[PDB]
Ligand binder design. Structure first.
Ligand SMILES: OC[C@H]1O[C@H](O)[C@H](O)[C@@H](O)[C@@H]1O
Ligand SMILES: OC[C@H]1O[C@H](O)[C@H](O)[C@@H](O)[C@@H]1O
Ligand SMILES: OC[C@H]1O[C@H](O)[C@H](O)[C@@H](O)[C@@H]1O
Ligand SMILES: OC[C@H]1O[C@H](O)[C@H](O)[C@@H](O)[C@@H]1O
Lengths: 388, 388, 388, 388
């Protein structure tokens, strides 16, 4: 009867989430900047396992090698004081005006080289802090108009960039993998590699595909009206779910980054059911923005809400799968048959099987109800805790 | 000053397009059925190069081997009489009630085996008629609720199915490739392999990836709010654009299948520019539905409109790229630099290049305007034929 | 601990809902036609209060005055046998090919006159069966292309039609009101009066506005990405919520008509909370389609699910509002202040109030957190039955 | 053969459009602030008729009565030097953190009173500068979660606010009307009065409805997937199109504010055709944002592009309507009949007209094609300048 998170739950937060000051396209900040050290302390008290960062969240852009050292030192001391881990790090290749046309796929060659150098420097830092995953979100890679970007040339530049980071990591002997985070649009009119599918496809064209996977975000796939759990299943099927960003989103519109559980509640249930049943072992990272209507107390309530909502859904999904009535319904809907090979007997035997065509009774097969509605209502009852 | 199509333009139409009777989810047919032989004659007169078909368009479901022979014979004679070709064929694995839960990924194993046998039979027919591409549109593969389909098991069944068709084609020595046509939703709540990206990713997991590519449709990618030309560029970059379905769609809503040129006009311009500049050599296939408000005369006007709109855009795109002012603008926006390697000098030289980081002037770089708006207005002027 | 519906709950269903045969734009029917008398019996056993119908659901198109009489007689006897009521009726001005360009706004004048006569005949029938509300869903009023419909002239024809039905009802002394059901698109490219707002605005231009209100549908407003509860609040505020259609919809895509509770679960919670708190006293009508994957047993399970889901949400919303912790949170977020007039003191006093401008401390006001996230998590806890 | 705008064309721009510095939710400004006086000079040279402003664009928030006077004086002198007019003004009730929960519908009563006082002060300024229209865009009126805002109470507060501004304007004897600008979402999760329809409906509940109309924006209606020209026709039909915001938007996603003509090109054509045929006489105001990739030269090219694109479409629409072949097609599609009353003979005569029902030949009527596709292709040919 308790939903208290503990570090063993592997809940993580970006510094930029609880640290979001509330500046939006139409308004000024509503909260003061949070010292990352304070963020780490508050999060550890809430039961979090660790934090993530962009280089620019930790070390202000333009810091001298000296101030940099100082900023890392204070951070490192907060991690030691709290026991918090840093499992993932990423680069800010979107805020500074130089990246207005992108980082790895900017038309200007000198900016692409700078983007790489900036990233490489942060990869060194990430390894030192113990991160296992390095995320790349190409927020500025894309266009508002068609002639501004030749997409085939942009994809060559993107592959070139990732191949170089792969050569770097391998030459240094680092134990770290990359994860590409898709987003369909915003802040560019259209962004390259807009969905999980596009990113997965792109990865197979890299020189060392085994080094790269995806970091899908609930809200981003939903901005394209796609089914998030289905996209995650395809990533898992491919062996490419290296990390995940959890949050909420209310349909096709701007990127909301609501707390996890908010937005599409049923999709959140099916997502938890899948992550737990597939045995996803990575961090449960929250990339959310406490709404700008909130003061600091609302910020911490929002973060606690993300973890609470995950734990409640995990309990409901587990009760759903453990329910014998549900196991019976799953067999009535033939989920058991879906998992059996269609033709382990082989092509030849299938061609010779008259029961597969010549003598197949299509009419009888057609008449068989799938019983999906009863199964779905059983799932609803479990979610709402209304199971008899 | 003429936009008359000729067979050399490679325009093709599905029998189900001009033959659509007008039955929609809320109303009865508004037109009588068209005899495929008549469809072939009318289309040849309009300047079309050929037609495509689903098995069930040509041979009514349940035909005896005898009537089948008769139907193919009459069709074949119309093709000989007109010189029309059949470059693509596909299977109907969606109309009959047996496929209500899918064909290759139905939960019922007996239906999956039947779907394969039905497909294999039509592949034999396709080769005989000279088709080079066999399209697969999994319209019924998917779900309306989360527990009805374990997506990892469904993907195993889908791969199993495609691998078997690949074994079949290779064992028979057929010269024919497969093309997967994505669609995000409708008629299922969510469809598997919902976008070009998801289909491309899936293909890399097949046993003989070289046999499969995609058959993207303008309207389907737009039902997910995605940029069609960008998706096509990624397919071309991957060497997987085996075929394409051209039509129009007005945003995120039901699958409209408006005539090509209708819907998002600018995207149609950028798509034509890309297909012609990349030297796409396959058919320009139209998968459209003449609206049910039309009589047969409106059906033929609609089909002629598809071809006319492609020819007009082709002329405008070619004039755009040939314009010296445009070539000058493209250099001002650094499209030339986008096409140059970021670091052909190699990783080591990039790491040692102080001009790439230590001494890079971010401020100067940032201040450089991209000149994208002038370029885009030049494109607009060309499209509207308002170029001085 | 029980969610059994009873006729006092005022749950109603259209004959076309449980009677949907499963024909969609890409497939044939998967279920046989249901005799309306059977539908009435099954629904009464489930705990329903009554049914609704389009003329064509009850009396097949083209029936002789004789067969018509017979069909009404059998229906009437089923209502007497079960105690079921008929609180609403409507016209089918969309299925028959004549209505391909609309009914009240068809370009052909002779069809508009026929649409009116067909409607008037059914209004007489509705009154006789005791219906209090007559719904109008202009599914075919609209266009796929811009020049096909002059919208100002179409609105004149629509107003003319409604004004005539108003004159008819008033001249006959009937006790019956009209309700306009909006839908943004499908089966037309764009439909006239696409949302609740457009319909409300249109009503104020009718000759006797007091005779007309709206019949909003959950899924239709969601097809435009709008907030359904907000739209319902505006209808209630205007005194125009005469009836309502409950169902589920998963975002911006084709009209799904999933069972109530499916789709956006949180919106369903907030909708129930609003209907119950505002004391909506009309029918709780379900306009849903049991998915075509189901057999008759799944049809009845789906219908029972609609009612169950409403009763569960009603219990959760009532517990939310009754919770003292929630009442405390509502005051912390100043919902109490929202309900107080901004300036009951009047314009002059506001202009002279220095505390309203000259001496207003914007900074202090700005710093006040709204506490919305804690309130929302309290709502989530109540919905999931996880309230301590 | 010329598309040069002149002040007689009535093209206007907001100071915040060409003055947009490029700050977005993910990045810093890419351009320096423009002095409003400079903006006025550059725009007059481009052929603009005038400018619009929010109070805070002209007078920086918190200015002393003294600096205010100075800022107005410099502005006024630029208008005199150039002959530029100021036909519309509006209030910034969204940037400052105090308005984080709204202005007129903030839960805090003290903020609602402040919002009114701030608005009233700017109305006085607007009249002095000669503005005929005062626009209200409630960007912060709304919510991210359901319990945060009781929408019926919010609508009472909104009506109360507008009624007070109406009392103020009437008591001062000012010649100025209000225009409500709808937007469905962003920066709030859902905004109140989300579409043209909702705003029109709301206006009929105000004390003096004749004082208020709408200021629809192309992109905002498109963020809800609605047909902009249709929404504008309904506004014109109601006599409520007081002003309009022109721009471009690519579908359902964040508010792009692309230059007019960009986005949905065909909708822009149909919009121009409607404004010119209905004789809309108000300003053609552009609310756009030159993309942040641009430098100042791209800013001015973008603004010139807005005007050019309107003039080109105006020429094409006029040629379309003047074409005798098009006038012939319009009669073939029965646009002439749409404009004729359905029953000027009256209810009684319609009831007695057997040709309207008893003897109506539905089959013959049904068989009549609408000829909409040929008409639409004629429109396309005209738009692309491909008319023989
Ligand atoms: O990839 C690193 C992070 O960068 C930015 O914060 C993006 O907004 C976020 O979605 C992404 O997760
Ligand atoms: O793939 C074959 C064809 O099957 C159906 O006709 C689909 O509606 C169409 O989009 C697809 O192209
Ligand atoms: O208005 C009567 C009914 O007609 C049709 O069944 C529409 O699909 C439904 O949404 C509407 O409620
Ligand atoms: O209403 C005044 C203006 O305020 C803001 O600039 C909005 O972003 C814009 O859409 C609106 O037109």
């Amino acid at each position: 009867m308790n939903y208290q998170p503990t570090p063993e739950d592997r809940f993580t937060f970006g510094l930029w989430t609880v640290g979001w000051q509330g500046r939006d396209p139409f308004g000024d900040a509503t909260r003061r900047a949070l010292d990352p050290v304070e963020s780490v302390r508050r999060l550890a008290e809430l039961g979090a396992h660790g934090v993530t960062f962009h280089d620019d969240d930790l070390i202000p852009f333009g810091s001298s090698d000296s101030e940099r050292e100082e900023h890392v030192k204070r951070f490192r001391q907060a991690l030691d004081d709290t026991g918090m881990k840093v499992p993932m790090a990423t680069t800010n290749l979107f805020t500074h005006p130089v990246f207005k046309d992108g980082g790895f796929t900017a038309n200007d060659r000198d900016v692409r080289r700078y983007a790489l150098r900036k990233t490489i420097r942060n990869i060194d830092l990430a390894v030192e802090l113990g991160a296992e995953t390095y995320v790349a979100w190409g927020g500025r890679e894309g266009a508002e108009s068609g002639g501004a970007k030749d997409v085939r040339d942009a994809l060559d530049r993107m592959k070139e960039a990732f191949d170089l980071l792969g050569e770097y990591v391998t030459s240094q002997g680092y134990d770290i993998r990359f994860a590409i985070e898709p987003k369909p649009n915003e802040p560019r009119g259209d962004i390259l590699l807009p969905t999980v599918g596009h990113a997965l496809a792109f990865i197979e064209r890299l020189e060392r595909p085994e080094l790269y996977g995806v970091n899908p975000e609930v809200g981003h796939e939903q901005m394209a009206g796609l089914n998030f759990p289905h996209g995650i299943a395809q990533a898992l099927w491919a062996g490419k779910l290296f990390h995940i960003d959890l949050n909420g989103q209310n349909g096709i519109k701007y990127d909301q980054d609501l707390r996890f559980g908010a937005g599409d509640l049923r999709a959140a249930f099916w997502l938890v059911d899948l992550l737990e049943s597939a045995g996803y072992s990575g961090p449960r990272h929250f990339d959310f923005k406490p709404p700008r209507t909130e003061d600091f107390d609302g910020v911490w309530a929002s973060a606690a809400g993300c973890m609470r909502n995950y734990l409640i859904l995990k309990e409901r999904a587990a009760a759903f799968r453990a329910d014998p009535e549900v196991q019976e319904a799953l067999r009535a809907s033939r989920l058991d048959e879906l998992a059996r090979p269609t033709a382990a007997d082989g092509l030849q035997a299938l061609l010779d099987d008259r029961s597969a065509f010549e003598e197949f009774d299509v009419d009888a097969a057609a008449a068989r109800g799938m019983a999906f509605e009863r199964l779905d209502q059983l799932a609803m009852d479990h979610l709402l805790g209304a199971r008899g």
